[PDB]
Nucleic acid binder design. Structure first.
Ligand SMILES: [Mg+2]
Ligand SMILES: [Mg+2]
Ligand SMILES: [Mg+2]
Ligand SMILES: [Mg+2]
Ligand SMILES: [Mg+2]
Ligand SMILES: [Mg+2]
Ligand SMILES: [Mg+2]
Ligand SMILES: [Mg+2]
Ligand SMILES: [Mg+2]
Ligand SMILES: [Mg+2]
Ligand SMILES: [Mg+2]
Ligand SMILES: [Mg+2]
Ligand SMILES: [Mg+2]
Ligand SMILES: [Mg+2]
Ligand SMILES: [Mg+2]
Ligand SMILES: [Mg+2]
Ligand SMILES: [Mg+2]
Ligand SMILES: [Mg+2]
Ligand SMILES: [Mg+2]
Ligand SMILES: [Mg+2]
Ligand SMILES: [Mg+2]
Ligand SMILES: [Mg+2]
Ligand SMILES: [Mg+2]
Ligand SMILES: [Mg+2]
Ligand SMILES: [Mg+2]
Ligand SMILES: [Mg+2]
Ligand SMILES: [Mg+2]
Ligand SMILES: [Mg+2]
Ligand SMILES: [Mg+2]
Ligand SMILES: [Mg+2]
Ligand SMILES: [Mg+2]
Ligand SMILES: [Mg+2]
Ligand SMILES: [Mg+2]
Ligand SMILES: [Zn+2]
Lengths: 135, 50, 60, 122, 86, 52, 134, 105
RNA sequence: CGACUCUUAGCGGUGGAUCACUCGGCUCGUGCGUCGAUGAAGAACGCAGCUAGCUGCGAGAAUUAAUGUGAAUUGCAGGACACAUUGAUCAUCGACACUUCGAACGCACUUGCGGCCCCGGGUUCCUCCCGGGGCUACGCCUGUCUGAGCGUCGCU
RNA sequence: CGCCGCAGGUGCAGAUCUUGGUGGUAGUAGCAAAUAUUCAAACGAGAACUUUGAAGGCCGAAGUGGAGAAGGGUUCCAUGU
RNA sequence: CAUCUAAGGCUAAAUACCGGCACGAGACCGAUAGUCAACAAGUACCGUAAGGGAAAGUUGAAAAGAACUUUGAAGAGAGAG
RNA sequence: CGCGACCUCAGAUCAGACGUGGCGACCCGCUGAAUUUAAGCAUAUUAGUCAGCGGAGGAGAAGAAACUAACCAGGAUUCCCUCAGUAACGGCGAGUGAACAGGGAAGAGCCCAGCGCCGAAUCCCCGCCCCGCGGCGGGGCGCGGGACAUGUGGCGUACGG
């Protein structure tokens, strides 16, 4: 899990926020691995990743990367999408599979938090006061 | 001090060169609105940034 | 006495003076003025008269 | 008396550089006159000679650049300054050919089921 | 004496000019600008100071390239062409 | 900016007001009292041919 | 009235454009009416004022029938200096008095190739207007 | 503090609502923009119907609206099969088709 | 009788209210919706005949070319400028150019010091000194070359 | 600007209110730490204060002397006002 | 019994827009107001630094911006224009 | 006892490319308070908000059901009206609080892996020739390299093929 990075465990505030241990990161370790691969190779695009092993202290994933400027990718349709600018650093905006799993997206009654495309989008729509011209 | 770097000396040179009164023919221009150099700096009153 | 480019060294000043005035110089002393311009004192070779050179340049 | 760019372009590199050298020695003499008092005519000639130097150098550089462009015409690799400089993002995007080429499945679909022009009666 | 007497002993500069951002905030002993964080690749900027952000945002300076970009955008960034000669 | 600049009026009210204004435009006392110099006008409900 | 949604009627904007106009359209702003004889000879009404054409002042202190050649078009101050539109200052030297070109009438035009081209273009546009409105 | 008789009111204004207020001064502009886009689209598909593909007859789901009939998303594959129109040809002649809708009766 | 003090009024000062003005804001709306290793944003230093700031610009430096325009710019001076063997000014801006820091890129900086390859000079080819030009950052993809392994093998 | 309507950032003596200006105090407090000045002349509209000369004094080499570091940045030097 | 077929991928439109480029408008403010900034304003200046941050619009239609005489060393006056 | 093939690694100022930094109003992913309210206060509230970090585009994200429903059934996403201050949550206190159906704006669908068949049918690079330049493509040749059977391309994807 994610230990809260506060000096000497002091989280100055109300007791409900005193937690330091037993805390958890919102994104998965696979998403973190994809993010590290993408940050190292910012000239490539993270496509997906998979699990290849684990230990008591380590997890091992293999991340598929695509060189967006190689001709074998540029000249092939159905892979030209990854070369568009709207797809750079998908793993840092949670657009891969592993990253998307943590956003609460989906269809139906279990996923009402994300109607509108994201939790923040749903929150804005539900917390905006629509002040029409004629009230 | 006497010991100074080239950058410091050049900065002081620019601040020296811009510490002069306005030319008198400026006030004869059309729609001037300028009377005297308000950015004058005296060495004893206002100290430079560096 | 010349006002030269602040980025020019003594070798460059010597060669420039030699080429564009057709004179031979002995040594170049160099300072940078408090206003930022570089000043070069170019001593001429003994067989050249700096007075005559200044007359030809037109700075008498 | 002044020089123009349109009558400089017929001349070759040697006489263009000769013109540039004459203008430069003239400008140096004008600066000497500026520091030794001089006259208003010689002080006003400084800008004219400076613009003439700029004009000659512009013609020289334009001639050289156009010659380089015609030399590198048709070559696979060109110097970066000879390549177009639209915008970094616009240089990063797909060219027209790979922008509009389609898969065999896409073009087979387009052949089999083309969009029809139709109207509906009321 | 914490006041006038102790003011007489300040003669060593903590900060110098910064080669990035040109401010007199380059801590010499830490080798770091306290305004832009120069040895860091990214400019130091915080949303708790909108006034400080607008002191140094884009447009407060010269915009040598961006002015030409804004002008060139109006004609589709055309290049390699000249007006038809007279 | 959210001062409620606009008001909504019932359609029946607005039609009522149009009818009242039209009815009052046919009474010479009311038009004269709006100050419209209808003194040589041959007929206050002044109707002209379609060729206008 | 004005219907074009891209031309402004704002007073501040119009004044700003007028007073910060570049000189090549200050030339348009500083136009003068032609005399009746010139307006009959050429089918034009107005004409930008020019360095070497002669005018009559029709408004102000210097109005009269006297023809005076323009000696200066001071576009920065939106005025023109004419030959005898002048006054003595304190020391006795004579200084030109600038007047607005809208307050003069051009009686003879300084004619050259460009002036003739502008005159015929204006006349042709006026004639196509008349034949459209016939 | 409550004052005499009244209604216990619970306004939802404890949450910095003034930063998220959606004014509607661009509503007439939006109506103009949508109207112009509709006109342009109708011009673009010149003889084709302006509103778009023909939609099927569909009964509203729940017990409150099942006495009412509205337009559906598209014609079902069974409908197209027993009408004799190919499912990939219908969309070119302007018949909307919903591959996920079944026919229960 | 005067001074002095108070009240009021005329005039004069001090002061900058009021009013009138407005090339400024604020608000709403529309259309676009474009930065960067081909070096951005930002910073520094420079650049005008007389120029400190603001503005503009980059050693071609208050601008070159080109196109449109068509006789000015102007505070003073100067000299242009047959307006046709082409033109002041302004606008536009597609050609050319664009100093030093800066992601900032040979190493380093509150200083400075390299290496490699060409060219010119003193040399009078051999490699020292001077100058000019071009390279020399990190990460990473494809390919290339050179390799390493008591890794897995084949042949001898 | 009046009248009929409409709409407000709509009326000040106070808030140790905000900004600006101005009084009495008041020609008042004060210009009193480290011994000290004086005579003549010159320049000059003008001299207790500047310059020269003469005198009397002080710092008294751990200086009120001669030079530097840091810091300042042209204060340096002539000429003029 | 109903309903879908997870753990791979793409996708326009309707939607958002207190930064930017260019516009238009207003029952808004009218120089202590309106942006901090109508003006050489993120300027002068303050702080080691992070940062803080002003004041400041109006001759006249046209400079025609008071020639000349006179007192004074001049500031400043009296005449004249 | 050396020469080869492969595998796994390394170096290069190797040939050609690509990333970095800025802006950040709008958008995506995280992280994340306390003032405040509760007339005290600790759960709660403020608030998944401020501040902090990262990443984009002219929009972004979402998106073609492991859906809603329980009906005579609807049918991707997004936005508006309404549902609704409701169901529900809550020291059941203060307070918080959606969704479905309905009406509209818009409307558009699809592609792989796998299972199979097709003599790898596939792709990149380097040369040479022609047509071109305006973002560098087409056509042709190469006993020219490489990638690739540890799987390229064509048919095909739950609506079946
Ligand atoms: Mg001091
Ligand atoms: Mg030296
Ligand atoms: Mg396929
Ligand atoms: Mg203390
Ligand atoms: Mg220290
Ligand atoms: Mg519709
Ligand atoms: Mg008075
Ligand atoms: Mg030109
Ligand atoms: Mg050192
Ligand atoms: Mg082996
Ligand atoms: Mg009030
Ligand atoms: Mg009061
Ligand atoms: Mg009261
Ligand atoms: Mg006293
Ligand atoms: Mg005393
Ligand atoms: Mg003694
Ligand atoms: Mg001493
Ligand atoms: Mg103000
Ligand atoms: Mg006032
Ligand atoms: Mg005085
Ligand atoms: Mg290389
Ligand atoms: Mg970035
Ligand atoms: Mg409380
Ligand atoms: Mg309380
Ligand atoms: Mg408390
Ligand atoms: Mg709590
Ligand atoms: Mg934030
Ligand atoms: Mg998208
Ligand atoms: Mg998506
Ligand atoms: Mg599906
Ligand atoms: Mg209700
Ligand atoms: Mg909540
Ligand atoms: Mg296959
Ligand atoms: Zn800095």
């Amino acid at each position: 899990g994610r230990k809260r990075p506060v000096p000497k465990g002091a989280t100055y505030g109300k007791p409900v926020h005193h937690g330091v241990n037993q805390l958890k990161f919102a994104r998965s370790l696979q998403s973190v691995a994809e993010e590290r691969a993408g940050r190292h190779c910012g000239a490539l695009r993270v496509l997906n990743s998979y699990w290849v092993g684990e230990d008591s202290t380590y997890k091992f994933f293999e991340v598929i990367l695509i060189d967006p400027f190689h001709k074998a990718i540029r000249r092939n349709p159905d892979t030209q999408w990854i070369t568009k600018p709207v797809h750079k650093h998908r793993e840092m905006r949670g657009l891969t599979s592993a990253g998307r799993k943590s956003r609460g997206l989906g269809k139906g009654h279990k996923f009402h938090h994300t109607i509108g495309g994201s939790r923040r989008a749903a929150w804005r729509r539900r917390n905006t006061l629509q002040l029409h011209r004629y009230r | 001090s006497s010991h100074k770097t080239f950058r410091i000396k050049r900065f002081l040179a620019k601040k020296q060169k811009q510490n002069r009164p306005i030319p008198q023919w400026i006030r004869m221009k059309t729609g001037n609105k300028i009377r005297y150099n308000s950015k004058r700096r005296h060495w004893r009153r206002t100290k430079l940034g560096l | 006495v010349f006002i030269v480019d602040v980025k020019a060294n003594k070798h460059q000043i010597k060669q420039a003076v030699k080429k564009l005035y057709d004179i031979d110089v002995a040594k170049v002393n160099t300072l940078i003025r408090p206003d930022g311009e570089k000043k070069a004192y170019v001593r001429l070779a003994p067989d050249y008269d700096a007075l005559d050179v200044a007359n030809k340049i037109g700075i008498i | 008396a002044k020089i123009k760019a349109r009558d400089l372009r017929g001349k070759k590199k040697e006489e263009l550089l000769k013109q540039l050298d004459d203008l430069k020695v003239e400008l140096s003499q004008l600066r000497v006159a500026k520091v030794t008092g001089g006259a208003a005519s010689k002080l006003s000639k400084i800008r004219v000679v400076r613009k003439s130097i700029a004009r000659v150098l512009t013609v020289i550089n334009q001639t050289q650049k156009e010659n380089l462009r015609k030399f590198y015409k048709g070559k696979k690799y060109k110097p970066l300054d000879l390549r177009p400089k639209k915008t970094r993002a616009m240089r990063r995007r797909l060219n027209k050919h790979e922008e509009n080429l389609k898969t065999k499945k896409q073009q087979r679909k387009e052949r089999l089921y083309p969009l029809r022009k139709y109207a509906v009666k009321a | 004496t914490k006041g006038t007497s102790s003011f007489g002993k300040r003669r060593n500069k903590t900060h110098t000019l910064c080669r990035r951002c040109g401010s007199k905030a380059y801590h010499l002993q830490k080798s770091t600008c306290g305004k832009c964080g120069y040895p860091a690749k990214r400019k130091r900027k915080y949303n708790w100071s909108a006034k400080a952000k607008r002191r140094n945002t884009t447009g407060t300076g010269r915009m040598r390239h961006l002015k030409i970009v804004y002008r060139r955008f109006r004609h589709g960034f055309r290049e390699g062409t000249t007006p038809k000669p007279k | 900016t959210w001062r409620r600049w606009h008001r909504r009026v019932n359609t029946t009210q607005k039609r009522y007001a149009i009818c009242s204004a039209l009815a009052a435009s046919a009474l010479p006392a009311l038009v004269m009292s709006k100050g419209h110099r209808i003194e040589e006008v041959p007929e206050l409900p002044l109707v002209v041919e379609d060729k206008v | 009235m004005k219907f074009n949604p891209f031309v402004t009627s704002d007073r501040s904007k119009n004044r700003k454009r007028h007073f910060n106009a570049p000189s090549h359209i200050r030339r348009k702003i500083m136009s003068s009416p032609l005399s009746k004889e010139l307006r009959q000879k050429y089918n034009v009404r107005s004409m930008p004022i020019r360095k070497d054409d002669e005018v009559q002042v029709v408004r102000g202190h210097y109005k009269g029938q006297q023809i005076g050649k323009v000696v200066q078009v001071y576009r920065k101050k939106y005025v023109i200096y004419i030959e005898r539109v002048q006054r003595e200052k304190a020391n006795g030297t004579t200084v030109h008095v600038g007047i607005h070109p809208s307050k003069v009438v051009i009686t003879r035009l300084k004619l050259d190739k460009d002036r003739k081209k502008i005159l015929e273009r204006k006349a042709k546009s006026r004639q196509v207007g008349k034949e459209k409105g016939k | 503090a409550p004052s005499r008789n009244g209604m216990v009111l619970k306004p939802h204004f404890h949450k910095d609502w003034q930063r998220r207020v959606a004014t509607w001064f661009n509503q007439p502009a939006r109506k103009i923009r949508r109207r112009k886009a509709r006109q342009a689209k109708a011009r673009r598909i010149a003889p084709r119907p302006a509103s778009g593909p023909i939609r099927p007859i569909v009964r509203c789901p729940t017990v409150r609206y099942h006495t009412k009939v509205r337009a559906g998303r598209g014609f079902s594959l069974e409908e197209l099969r027993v009408a004799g129109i190919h499912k990939k040809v219908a969309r070119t002649i302007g018949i909307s088709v919903d591959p996920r809708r079944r026919n229960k009766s």
